[PDB]
């Protein structure tokens, strides 16, 4: 059960996009994309990609999806919902989320194990710890090489970010 955990997260990841590709609201759309970002980050972190998972949290979720929720909250005029005493205002939430985990556990059925067991990855998929690397994360040093090897990449990226600042300030003027 514990072996297939990345695969399990990937299934949840797929289900997470069905949370918001059906598009119930842009606000619940942002909420589903935040949950999907967290579980895809779990997929990244379970291959030893620690810095890239923390870039998912720090830059994608805490950097950009904050701005998406911020711009969404400056639009789409709100309206109240059901606000009866606690047999509705939290009990329906708990029964709905228990049905959501019921849906998560419900898809691991006989139509799934014909794909899981015929194409068993866990046992031979996650091979990032194949031998020794040394005193360094290879992924950390590969990201560190952006400054010595990636001179042109850093030039065009910083130029695109400066042009991004200029472009946003020109189009958001109205004059």
């Amino acid at each position: 059960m514990m072996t297939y955990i990345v695969f399990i997260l990937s299934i949840i990841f797929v289900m997470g996009f069905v949370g918001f590709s059906s598009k119930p609201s842009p606000i619940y759309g942002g909420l589903g994309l935040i949950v999907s970002g967290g579980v895809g980050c779990g997929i990244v972190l379970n291959f030893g990609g620690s810095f890239l998972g923390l870039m998912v949290f720090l830059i994608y979720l805490g950097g950009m999806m904050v701005v998406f929720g911020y711009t969404t909250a400056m639009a789409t005029e709100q309206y109240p919902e059901v606000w009866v005493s606690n047999k509705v205002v939290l009990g329906t939430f708990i029964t709905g989320l228990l049905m959501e985990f019921l849906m998560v556990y419900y898809v691991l059925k006989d139509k799934e194990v014909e794909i899981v067991f015929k194409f068993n990855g866990m046992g031979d998929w996650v091979i990032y710890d194949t031998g020794d690397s040394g005193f360094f994360s290879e992924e950390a040093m590969g990201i560190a090489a952006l400054y010595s090897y990636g001179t042109w990449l850093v030039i065009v990226t910083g130029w695109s970010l400066l042009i991004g600042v200029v472009v946003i300030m020109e189009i958001t003027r109205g004059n």
């Binding site: 606000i27 620690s50 205002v89």
Partner: protein, 311 residues
């Protein structure tokens, strides 16, 4: 055995947050020439327990919520991110010893504005939504200088490891080569938690009951104690004997208490900023100095041949 360690982290956090209210009211009492609470318990030691039992049986306001799910998930996220910021903190050895604990804490604190934003949209008020948007803009503003100051200090560390930050400061405190980063870091952590003189929420989560307000309240104070401990580890790092870890634990405890009382002593001393005045403080005062000191702490270990070890 590990679950025992998680409980012995998280239960004393909640007890320390409970008695921080007593320490705040007593220290703000004596600084305002008055006394703080002394009637309820002996010298006030039952005032947090009485306040907690009062807030946890107070009537829910029957809130006209714009959403159920964000109304529930804002205190849940607030408490979860209040607790999970503590697990890489080296005291002198953390609960979760990870190689990127600094970046982990920066990420989990950058995720902490969703509790504000979801509390704001989960209210029906447009005024509460405007206050929440102002608070979110303030917090993500000061997260910029959190990240740049933190990067500039860790150019002397070698890596994002918090336990390595104890090894870095065994000869000198890191406030000596980095005191402008220290003072701007301290004002930036003051402005993260919406703490005075940056508390324009008392100048967004009032849609909640008194119980969920106590949850946001205790998450805010856990963030206050946590950022004081993180500043203590980051600039005033204590001596560590590996055969007696209680020397380091008592030393950073005393320094963390002094820095938390320094928050309590700042809030009883200054008027509040106007909102554009603290946006002026960030974007026009702290950010040029912070970028210049980032350039300085990049280029300075290269010119002094003091580049810290990677491992």
């Amino acid at each position: 055995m590990f679950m025992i360690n998680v409980l012995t982290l998280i239960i004393p956090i909640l007890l320390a947050v409970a008695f921080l209210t007593l320490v705040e009211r007593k220290v703000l009492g004596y600084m305002q020439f008055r006394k703080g609470p002394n009637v309820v318990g002996p010298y006030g030691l039952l005032q947090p327990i009485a306040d907690a039992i009062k807030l946890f049986i107070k009537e829910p306001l029957r809130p006209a919520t714009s959403s159920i799910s964000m109304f529930i998930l804002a205190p849940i996220l607030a408490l979860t991110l209040a607790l999970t910021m503590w697990i890489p903190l080296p005291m002198p050895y953390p609960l979760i010893n990870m190689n990127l604990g600094v970046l982990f804490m920066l990420a989990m604190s950058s995720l902490a504005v969703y509790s504000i934003l979801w509390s704001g949209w989960a209210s029906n008020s447009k005024y509460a939504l405007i206050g929440a948007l102002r608070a979110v803009a303030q917090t993500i503003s000061y997260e910029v200088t959190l990240a740049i100051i933190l990067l500039s200090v860790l150019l002397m560390n070698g890596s994002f490891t918090l336990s390595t930050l104890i090894i870095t400061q065994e000869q000198v405190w890191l406030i000596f080569p980095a005191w402008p980063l220290a003072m701007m870091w301290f004002i930036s952590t003051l402005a993260e938690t919406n703490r005075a003189p940056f508390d324009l929420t008392e100048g967004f989560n009032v849609e909640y009951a008194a119980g969920p307000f106590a949850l946001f309240f205790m998450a805010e104070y856990a963030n206050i104690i946590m950022m004081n401990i993180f500043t203590t580890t980051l600039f005033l790092g204590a001596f560590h004997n590996p055969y007696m870890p209680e020397l380091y634990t008592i030393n950073f405890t005393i320094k963390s208490l002094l820095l938390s009382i320094t928050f309590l002593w700042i809030r009883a001393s200054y008027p509040r900023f106007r909102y554009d005045q603290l946006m002026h403080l960030l974007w026009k005062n702290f950010l040029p100095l912070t970028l210049a000191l980032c350039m300085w702490h990049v280029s300075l270990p290269i010119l002094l041949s003091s580049i810290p070890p990677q491992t």
